[PDB]
Design a protein around this ligand. Structure first.
Ligand SMILES: COc1ccc(S(=O)(=O)Nc2nccs2)cc1
Lengths: 452, 167
């Protein structure tokens, strides 16, 4: 085929080690080469390639491009790519085999951009002005169908299914009596279900815009990662609430009941595949104030000690068992996000933004593919909801937990540890006795549902 | 069985602490990294002629999970307390990181090393003397490292392995 010069159309420049390099493997389901690195022009040529469509590359590119190219600069390149100059029998082939496919591909990119990364347009209303402009100028019977589609999505974006779930379980607290709700008064099955529902919505609300570019670690983390941060803060508040429940229960018999109830909640989190909930309990148990309460743990049934020991092993050997158990299960589940955060950060920190070949800078795409592989792994567990009925009063109770109160982390942390030393002094100080504080019975109703 | 040392990197976030362990684990002319694979946190090394395995835990990115520190921290034999020489807050945070490590290990003598990392050509706001003074007050070594050039990294880790051995 014969194409115009680089002085009129930049995308016509042929492939070379100076502008594009590949990985030695091919896309498994597509047979398409895997780009390792390339220039922004060559990466945009492959994004809108004439010979074949490359969906994975479109999804990877649109998710991770903002590090190497600005949204307003990308629109201009995909507009420039569409505006093809001509270089009979030769012309009829070029129009059909290179102009029509390349144009169709930029329109597909535009549709993907608008459908899945609309945030770009919500943050730059001129970007949306130019998109609607460009789209308006596009003419052809072939185009009309995709131009109609893009417009229908923009307008939608501007506007902004199961069997019966189980019966909500109750223990001492009766429905409507929020005033009496606490760890031991609510049913442990319902505590775990209601926390799982909360934690599942928190997990499903996290977007790749909050992760790509390691933006949750930067100075504007509160602006760019609000949902991730609410999610981590909920987790932290639950661990702190479990530690507080334990160490503020000074009577050893009552405290043993508290820890046993928390292990019962952990068991139900295991049953529900709530790995975030599982580690909230493990973290609370392995905290400095709790880990040292030997008199409390001596009185805990071996079955519960073993349940806790198995949950802890998930974390061991750099989350080896956790990672296997997650691979072995299917949705719904609430994964532990921390691993994904460390893997995105280390991928971004441990790889160069650019590779140099014959003294020319190539953008390192592989680094972006690896980040995009993790964001996809996050998204694969965000689609499936749980078949559990919400209980609005138990939900609000957990949404409003504030164990720290008005204290700072250190001030609270020290208080928790001092309480731990108070209730179980350091050896050889003998064990003091403390008065009971619960006027209701401590026997658990169990983790097996009372109703079929 | 060769000796396996469980090392824990601790420090403020948002200041390139991850570079330290990455540069250790990856080869001196290999700038590629996949945090997914096992080889990415275990390294065989020869220190003072005696071969050993270094198992490094760096939870870079999980700073907001503050209630998980105690757990992550209790797994370590020795600790690298990292700060950035262009960030005073990260230096001011070392006092509490160290107080936490001591509380978790239930010991005043924990193999520990203070690391001052230079992550960019930004202005140094922490003078080596401030840091050397602080390390002396705590009674631990001080190592400065460069993320750009790999200068100091090996000394930072080997000094900790020496601190564990001499404990
Ligand atoms: C060998 O170290 C451990 C083995 C098991 C556990 S654990 O039982 O999973 N966690 C505990 N937290 C408090 C008391 S017991 C913790 C540590």
């Amino acid at each position: 085929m014969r194409l115009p010069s680089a002085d009129v159309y930049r995308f016509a420049e042929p492939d070379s080690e100076e502008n594009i390099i590949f990985e030695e493997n091919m896309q498994p389901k597509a047979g398409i080469p895997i780009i390792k690195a390339g220039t922004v022009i060559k990466l945009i040529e492959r994004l809108t390639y004439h010979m074949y469509a490359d969906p994975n590359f479109v999804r990877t590119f649109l998710t991770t491009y903002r590090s190497f190219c600005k949204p307003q600069e990308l629109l201009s390149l995909i507009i420039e790519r569409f505006e093809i100059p001509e270089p009979s029998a030769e012309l009829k082939r070029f129009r059909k085999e290179y102009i029509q496919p390349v144009q169709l591909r930029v329109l597909n990119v535009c549709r993907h951009w608008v459908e899945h990364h609309f945030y770009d347009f919500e943050r730059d209303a001129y970007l949306l002005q130019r998109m609607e402009e460009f789209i308006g100028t596009v003419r052809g019977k072939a185009m009309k169908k995709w131009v109609e589609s893009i417009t229908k999505i923009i307008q939608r974006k501007k506007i902004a299914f199961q069997s019966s779930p189980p019966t909500v379980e109750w223990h001492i607290s009766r429905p409507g009596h929020i005033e009496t709700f606490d760890l031991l008064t609510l049913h442990p099955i319902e505590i775990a279900r209601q926390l799982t529902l909360l934690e599942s919505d928190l997990y499903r609300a996290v977007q790749p815009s909050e992760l790509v570019g390691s933006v949750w670690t930067k100075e504007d983390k509160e602006i760019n990662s609000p949902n991730l941060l609410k999610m981590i803060r909920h987790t932290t508040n639950l661990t702190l609430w479990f530690e507080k429940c334990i160490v503020e229960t000074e009577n050893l018999e009552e405290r043993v009941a508290v820890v046993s109830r928390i292990i019962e909640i952990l068991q139900v989190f295991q049953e529900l595949n709530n790995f975030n909930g599982v580690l909230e309990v493990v973290s609370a148990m392995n905290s400095s104030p709790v880990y040292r309460l030997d008199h409390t743990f001596e009185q805990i049934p071996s079955r519960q000690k073993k349940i806790l020991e198995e949950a802890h092993e998930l974390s061991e050997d750099h989350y080896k068992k956790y990672l296997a158990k997650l691979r072995s299960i299917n949705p719904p589940c609430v994964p532990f996000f921390g691993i994904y955060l460390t893997n995105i950060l280390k991928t971004e920190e441990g790889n160069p933004e650019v590779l140099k070949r014959h003294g020319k800078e190539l953008i390192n795409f592989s680094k972006r593919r690896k980040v995009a592989e993790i964001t996809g792994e996050i998204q694969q567990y965000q689609n499936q909801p749980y078949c559990l009925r919400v209980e609005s009063d138990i939900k609000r109770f957990f949404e409003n937990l504030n164990p720290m109160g008005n204290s700072m982390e250190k001030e609270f942390t020290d208080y928790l540890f001092n309480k731990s030393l108070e209730i179980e002094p350091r050896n050889p100080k003998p064990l003091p006795r403390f008065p009971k504080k619960y006027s209701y019975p401590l026997k658990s109703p169990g983790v097996r549902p009372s109703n079929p | 069985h060769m000796t396996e040392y469980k090392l824990v990197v601790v420090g403020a976030g948002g200041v390139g602490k991850s570079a330290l362990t990455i540069q250790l684990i990856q080869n001196h002319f290999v700038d590629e990294y996949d945090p997914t694979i096992e080889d990415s946190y275990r390294k065989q090394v020869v220190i003072d002629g005696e071969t050993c395995l270094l198992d490094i835990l760096d939870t870079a990115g999980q700073e907001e999970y503050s209630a998980m520190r105690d757990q992550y921290m209790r797994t370590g034999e020795g600790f690298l307390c990292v700060f950035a020489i262009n960030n005073t807050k990260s230096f001011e945070d070392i006092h509490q990181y160290r107080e936490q490590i001591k509380r978790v290990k239930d010991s005043d003598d924990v193999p520990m090393v203070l690391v001052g990392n230079k992550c960019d050509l930004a202005a140094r706001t922490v003078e080596s003397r401030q840091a050397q003074d602080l390390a002396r007050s705590y009674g631990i070594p001080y190592i400065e490292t460069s993320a750009k050039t790999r200068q100091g990294v090996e000394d930072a880790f080997y000094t900790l392995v020496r601190e564990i051995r001499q404990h």
